[PDB]
Amino acid sequence: RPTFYRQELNKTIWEVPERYQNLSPVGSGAYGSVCAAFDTKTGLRVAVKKLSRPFQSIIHAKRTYRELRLLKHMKHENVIGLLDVFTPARSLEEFNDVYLVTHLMGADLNNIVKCQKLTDDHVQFLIYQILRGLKYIHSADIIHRDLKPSNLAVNEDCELKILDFGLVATRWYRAPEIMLNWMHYNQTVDIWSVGCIMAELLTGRTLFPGTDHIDQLKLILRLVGTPGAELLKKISSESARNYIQSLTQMPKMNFANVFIGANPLAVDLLEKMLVLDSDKRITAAQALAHAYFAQYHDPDDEPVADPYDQSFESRDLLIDEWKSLTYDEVISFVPPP
Numbered sequence: 001r002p003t004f005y006r007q008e009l010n011k012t013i014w015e016v017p018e019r020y021q022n023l024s025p026v027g028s029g030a031y032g033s034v035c036a037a038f039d040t041k042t043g044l045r046v047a048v049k050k051l052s053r054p055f056q057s058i059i060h061a062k063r064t065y066r067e068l069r070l071l072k073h074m075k076h077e078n079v080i081g082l083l084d085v086f087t088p089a090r091s092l093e094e095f096n097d098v099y100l101v102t103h104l105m106g107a108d109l110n111n112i113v114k115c116q117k118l119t120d121d122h123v124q125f126l127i128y129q130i131l132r133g134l135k136y137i138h139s140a141d142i143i144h145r146d147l148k149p150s151n152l153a154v155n156e157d158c159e160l161k162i163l164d165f166g167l168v169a170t171r172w173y174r175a176p177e178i179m180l181n182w183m184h185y186n187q188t189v190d191i192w193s194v195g196c197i198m199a200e201l202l203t204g205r206t207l208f209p210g211t212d213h214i215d216q217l218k219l220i221l222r223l224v225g226t227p228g229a230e231l232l233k234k235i236s237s238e239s240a241r242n243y244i245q246s247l248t249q250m251p252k253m254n255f256a257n258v259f260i261g262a263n264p265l266a267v268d269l270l271e272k273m274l275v276l277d278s279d280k281r282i283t284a285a286q287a288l289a290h291a292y293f294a295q296y297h298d299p300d301d302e303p304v305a306d307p308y309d310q311s312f313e314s315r316d317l318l319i320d321e322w323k324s325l326t327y328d329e330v331i332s333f334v335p336p337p
């Protein structure tokens, strides 16, 4: 076992192996705190995440397991992966803290959209990278569900990775079918979010700044139109249909006019991503092949993920069982060497 050393950072205690030095808090992100650090073994700058109350309840214990499982699975340049996972506990009975370690990126897409206004060329490269990561995640039967600029980490190299998959005001990037509470949504939920993000990078403003679920829907429908007959036929919920069909009908706007000065390829991709009916929305793989990404696209360099066992998601287990499963996964971890 390595030697651990202990310190307090913003009320939080951190017990990490001596290999990680100069810890510096870089913010709380719900369910955990993050420090930047220097990894003496690799020479790399890393982010270390301490999970908050990983075993507080069955929900938390299952969530801790899920995140560790997801992170051990993801091995892709545009998806956050694991350099290390550790606990200061020397046995299962002593196990109550999980630390997760990844390459430090040091910014997010908000930190890039803000005050700086990106060229079409930067937009192509950033969105290419999101789609490249999404192709991979989607190939493992994983849906992000909460893609937004603050979940997209970007380094000084303009290299991007998706954070917080499978687990700043999130509702602005949410697919309309989720605002309506549909339980059978598909992976193109994430493509909607990409469309909202891409629009924001092109225009410098939030495409749909909703104040609540209902206001969000209204803003979406003014751009994309109220549902046509084919989509209306697909809504089971009487309450949902009463509401939608009770709104004043709106036509789909002309995207070429809304995004007036943008690359006409960017506009074309936007309208394929922001299709109301999720069954008609472009997939991540299809989007990568869109002419907008001509300068970046290579099918031989856009890998798919190994099979991911999500069967645990259906299981109703005790806290101690989720805890022991998580311990097993910490101990079996094999670093990228």
Ligand SMILES: CNC(=O)c1ccc(C)c(-n2c(C)cc(OCc3ccc(F)cc3F)c(Br)c2=O)c1
Binding pocket: 026, 027, 029, 034, 035, 036, 047, 048, 049, 071, 080, 081, 082, 083, 100, 101, 102, 103, 104, 105, 106, 107, 108, 150, 152, 153, 163
């Ligand atoms: C405030 N300045 C920063 O250094 C700064 C600014 C913005 C961001 C998104 C970040 N930042 C954050 C928060 C988390 C982060 O990774 C979290 C994280 C995920 C998985 C894991 F196994 C270990 C981790 F730790 C990275 Br990687 C990162 O880069 C840092």
Ligand SMILES: Fc1ccc(-c2c[nH]nc2-c2ccnc(F)c2)cc1
Binding pocket: 176, 177, 180, 181, 182, 227, 231, 234, 235, 236, 237, 240, 244, 276, 277, 278, 279
């Ligand atoms: F106002 C609306 C109406 C429908 C959607 C929608 C988009 N894609 N799929 C749906 C959908 C399909 C089946 N049942 C639902 F409830 C929703 C979104 C907003």
